[PDB]
Design a binder for this molecule. Sequence first.
Ligand SMILES: O=c1[nH]c(=O)c2[nH+]cn([C@@H]3O[C@H](COP(=O)(O)O)[C@@H](O)[C@H]3O)c2[nH]1
Ligand SMILES: O=c1[nH]c(=O)c2[nH+]cn([C@@H]3O[C@H](COP(=O)(O)O)[C@@H](O)[C@H]3O)c2[nH]1
Lengths: 208, 208
Amino acid sequence: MIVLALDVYEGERAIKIAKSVKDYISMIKVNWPLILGSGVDIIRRLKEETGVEIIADLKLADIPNTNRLIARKVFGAGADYVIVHTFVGRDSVMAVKELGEIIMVVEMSHPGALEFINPLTDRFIEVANEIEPFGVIAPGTRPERIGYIRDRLKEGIKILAPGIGAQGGKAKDAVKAGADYIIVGRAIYNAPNPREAAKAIYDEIRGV
Amino acid sequence: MIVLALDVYEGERAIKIAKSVKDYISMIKVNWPLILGSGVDIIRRLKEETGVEIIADLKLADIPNTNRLIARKVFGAGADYVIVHTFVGRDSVMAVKELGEIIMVVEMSHPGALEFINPLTDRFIEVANEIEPFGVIAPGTRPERIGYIRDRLKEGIKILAPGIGAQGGKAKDAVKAGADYIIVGRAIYNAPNPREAAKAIYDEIRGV
Ligand SMILES: O=c1[nH]c(=O)c2[nH+]cn([C@@H]3O[C@H](COP(=O)(O)O)[C@@H](O)[C@H]3O)c2[nH]1
Ligand SMILES: O=c1[nH]c(=O)c2[nH+]cn([C@@H]3O[C@H](COP(=O)(O)O)[C@@H](O)[C@H]3O)c2[nH]1
């Protein structure tokens, strides 16, 4: 099950790519840049033009009432899931979950992640286990980490993995490692033929 | 020096209120809900209509590249400062700092803050000491914490403190404890007469 990271911040060209690959993806993930550049409306619309669920990658990390306000507006705009940080606390996570499905951040892949976030991943996983969000993000650059998290995460809580390598077999390996969804951006929206690249990743995943 | 927390999500109503108190405030702080409701261009309009600097309280907490994309757009839209989290690491903070002035989060006041953020406040302050942002936010609801932070914060980094009025904090207390700026929302924008409310706090802060 593929998640398209529509990180093509230019208007209509972003929507064109998403509608044409709708057959091979399960969700569409949008971030703050797209939202800022096109307005929160690009959400309602990415929807009624692809028919695919949408994940608003916002990494909410504010106080409860502000997280709530943002969620209400984003869910209200059509988002199906909102990604939220675990670091700011449970009340802030629950404020969003109360209005819609959430995906919690328990680990990150940039150099800075090793400073405070990653040392707390085991603890964040346990928070995730108690809250039972729809899922958690797990950088899949290294399958070992997806399995690490999968071993500690409650069954029923999905794992979505970004940073999937471009080599043939990587997407399949991330799923085998425990990822329920692989989040792919570049390798798809910047490929000569998007639908084709989407189909390739899709076919790879189901082993044939 | 007052920072108006303009938590009025109807763009025109926000401008109307901001304009009526513009001569008693130093800056205007806006968060995601207002940006989502009126579009990020509301920052430009608020600046033109009031003549005061704008702080975008986004609490950025993404990877360096994404934090930079967001900051580029927001500083580009006219923001003078962007509030960023320290927990995501130095690289993510610097990604924003390289594009404009920043204010770092080293401690929060909601209950969830006790779980992971506050236990790390001393370490966050040392990270802020190294990076040297324009300022850090300090809890105005507990003047004892403003002084605690001030003592450990490198000289030159400013302290801005919310929590005055509605949350029970006093402007006079916060300034006495070391706050350079007092962040106030409801006590001014929900006052029967905002300009009068803004003047009063202005007077309170001036009387020492
Ligand atoms: O939660 C996350 N932590 C990370 O460290 C990270 N690095 C990349 N990404 C996101 O992965 C998606 C696909 O990235 P690529 O363009 O390299 O395929 C895109 O949405 C990228 O933004 C991350 N998401
Ligand atoms: O820790 C907190 N607990 C709260 O209940 C709370 N309410 C508001 N805020 C933050 O303070 C800014 C201005 O708030 P006021 O309208 O209460 O003056 C607001 O814009 C927020 O940034 C809060 N922070």
